[PDB]
Amino acid sequence: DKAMAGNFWQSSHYLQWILDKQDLLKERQKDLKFLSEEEYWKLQIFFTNVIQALGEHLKLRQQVIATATVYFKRFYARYSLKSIDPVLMAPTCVFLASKVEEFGVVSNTRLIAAATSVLKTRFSYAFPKEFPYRMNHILECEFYLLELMDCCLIVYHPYRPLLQYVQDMGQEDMLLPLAWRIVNDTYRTDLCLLYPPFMIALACLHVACVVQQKDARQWFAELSVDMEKILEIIRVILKLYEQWKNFDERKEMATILSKMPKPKPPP
Amino acid sequence: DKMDYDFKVKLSSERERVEDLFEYEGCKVGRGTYGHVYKAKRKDGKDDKDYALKQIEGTGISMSACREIALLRELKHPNVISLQKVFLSHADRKVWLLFDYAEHDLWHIIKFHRASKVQLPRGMVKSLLYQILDGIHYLHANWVLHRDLKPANILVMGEGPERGRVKIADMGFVVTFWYRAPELLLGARHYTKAIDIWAIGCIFAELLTSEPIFHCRQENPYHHDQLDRIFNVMGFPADKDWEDIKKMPEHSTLMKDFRRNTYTNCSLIKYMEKHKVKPDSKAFHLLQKLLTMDPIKRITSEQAMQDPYFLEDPLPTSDVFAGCQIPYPKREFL
Ligand SMILES: Cc1ccc(-n2nc(C(C)(C)C)cc2NC(=O)NCCCN2CCOCC2)cc1
Ligand code: NA
């Protein structure tokens, strides 16, 4: 079993990196001078997809991709998009996550070739120029990322408690593929910054049950959990699919990216 | 590159630097594979305590640096060394870890008693073992295996608010195999909780006698002489004592090199009697449950903590020195 698996309630994740929604939105106002609320949540979807694409190209497991995504989110939860290029931050987060999750140090040539290939083949709609960064940029960015996170590296995700819930249900084959997919989709939102992973797992499982018309009401009722919180999470999940429907990422992202606040150069 | 200037200079202005906060030049007390360890004083002197600074070997966030930081950032237990602060030095890409300084360790403590030949006091031995087990139980409960337990990695706090408290650490290294479980020596591919327990059994024997129980001269996972020493002490295992020994990758090498009749008169009972530990002692019965050859027949750290040895007079104390004066010399500089 994995290091620190049962320690969430004494973890750095829980004690330092479950943020208050009002604090998150207050810090976001910096960037909302340049971008609408809508455009900001579109950028988050976009960079979630970039990190996923990078992880898939490098053949990393979903949990590594999830950890990299959390690192990215934590950074921009505190800092403006202009502070470090998110194009640099995304592969840096994947690079650090891979080391933390014990898959290893992605080589210089491989990390930079993955960044370059993915942006070219999967995101040419957003990026007409080649990936301009080199490994010295990644290494510098990694130092800033580690500092902002206050060296909080171990991250808990909804996949493990989800698996435990569906096994307990006796419905792993029926429900796990959909519920797992919905957990992936929650990384398009702020949910992982605001709720413990097990609550997110329960919300995703509920939505999977509703989609597959499975009555799990009695099982859900028998849990000892704040259902008001679970319903809050379900509402965000249902909204993320309506947002998905209405969002044309390929048509919109080039213009949204050009509206991002740009860094001050040196004097 | 392409990094916002205001963001950068603000962070630079605020970033605490190890050399500004601590005096450590010429104060190296540890040199090893993982880095350099210095005994440090705070420059801004609101404090006279000793601090340990570790400069991690290499630059950047190696797998080693990343592992140590990730784990120590989460771990919190009185018997596990506690990371106080991480300094990231941008000028040289060096990483520094800050700890409260632990003056003593079991390597030096045992050497002191081995040289004076005063055995280790029996209250102290018990209190040390209890705290070692407490720290490893916490690590094991969190699926953290130590993988290199030995006296040098069992720190003990000196004078101060944690006087006599054990801190499990990992100092690194070239290498002895004296604390390595027999399954490792027969080619076992994976570290386990049982491997840590055997090492604790070894440390316990060494606390009782002042001698490393499986001491061996200097020499693949197969180490003939180390195994020979283990058999000289324990006897050669019967089939029924370790049924899966046949599944060890080096089992046929063992059969080629060894004959059980060589060790007929050998037993842990006999070894410990020679060092004046009675085989009817609760101490001995616990030791024997830790130093079980088959790893699946070793007791766990929790079970060890529940052993009636810890309820027998004298009870283990929080300060392993029992409030008594500490005769052990302070750790010397390298
Ligand atoms: C690559 C690597 C290296 C070490 C660790 N590690 N692991 C541990 C355990 C006990 C939690 C298993 C402790 C450390 N680091 C360490 O003890 N550092 C030395 C502490 C120095 N002492 C502080 C107190 O004063 C004496 C020196 C992890 C990964
Ligand atoms: Na414990």
Class of domain B102-334: mainly alpha
What backbone phi and psi angles, to 5 degrees, belong to A91? -70, -30
Pairing state of beta strands B35-42 and B22-23? antiparallel
CA of B4 to the centre of ligand 2 (A): 47
Chain A residues near residue B1 by CB distance under 8 angstroms = 88, 133, 136-137, 140
The full set of domain ranges for chain B reads 1-101, 102-334
Return the DSSP state at B30.
Answer: E
Q: Under a CB-based contact definition with an 8 Å cutoff, are residues B241 and B207 in contact?
A: no
Q: How far apart are CA B70 and CA B225, in angstroms?
A: 37
Interface residue of B56, B61, B96 to substitute, partner A, most A CBs within 10 Å? B61
CA distances, B302 to each of B137, B193, B201, B319 (Å): 6, 11, 14, 21
Q: Per DSSP, what are the bridge partners of residue B40?
A: B51
CATH superfamily of B1-101: Phosphorylase Kinase; domain 1 (3.30.200.20)
Return residues with CB closer than 5 A to ligand 2 (ion): B 134, 137-138
Q: How far apart are CA B59 and CA B55, in angstroms?
A: 10
B92 contact A CB<8A: no
C-beta atoms of B15 and A263 within 8 A: no
Half-sphere exposure of A92 (CA within 13 A, CB side): 26
Pairing state of beta strands B94-100 and B85-89? antiparallel
Q: How far apart are CA B259 and CA B261, in angstroms?
A: 5
A144 contact B CB<8A: yes
> For the purposes of burial, counting CB atoms within 10 Å of the CB of A178, is it exposed (0-12), middle (13-18) or buried (19 or more)?
middle
Half-sphere exposure of A138 (CA within 13 A, CB side): 23
CA distances, A154 to each of A14, A163, B72 (Å): 11, 20, 10
CA distances, B285 to each of A77, A157, A261, B202 (Å): 56, 44, 70, 14
Atom of ligand 1 nearest to the CA of B170: 17
- Output the ligand 1 site: residues, CB below 6 A: B 34, 37, 52, 54, 64, 67-68, 71, 75, 80-81, 99, 101-102, 146, 155, 168-171
Domains in chain A with CATH codes: 1-22+155-267 (1.10.472.10), 23-154 (1.10.472.10)
Return the DSSP state at B272.
Answer: H
* B47 tagged catalytic: no
CA distances, B83 to each of A151, B60, B69, B89 (Å): 11, 18, 8, 17
Ligand nearest to the CA of B144: 1
Q: Determined by which method?
A: X-ray
Atom of ligand 1 nearest to the CA of B75: 11
User: What's at B15, amino acid-wise?
Assistant: R
Q: Under a CB-based contact definition with an 8 Å cutoff, are residues A91 and A140 in contact?
A: no
Is residue B37 marked as binding? yes
Instruction: Give me the residue from A1, A6, A154 closest to B70, CB to CB.
Output: A154
Ligand nearest to the CA of B304: 2
Given in angstroms, what resolution was this structure solved at? 2.1
C-beta atoms of B71 and A3 within 8 A: yes
Tokens representing residue A95 in the block: 């690079």
Q: How far apart are CA B95 and CA B313, in angstroms?
A: 46
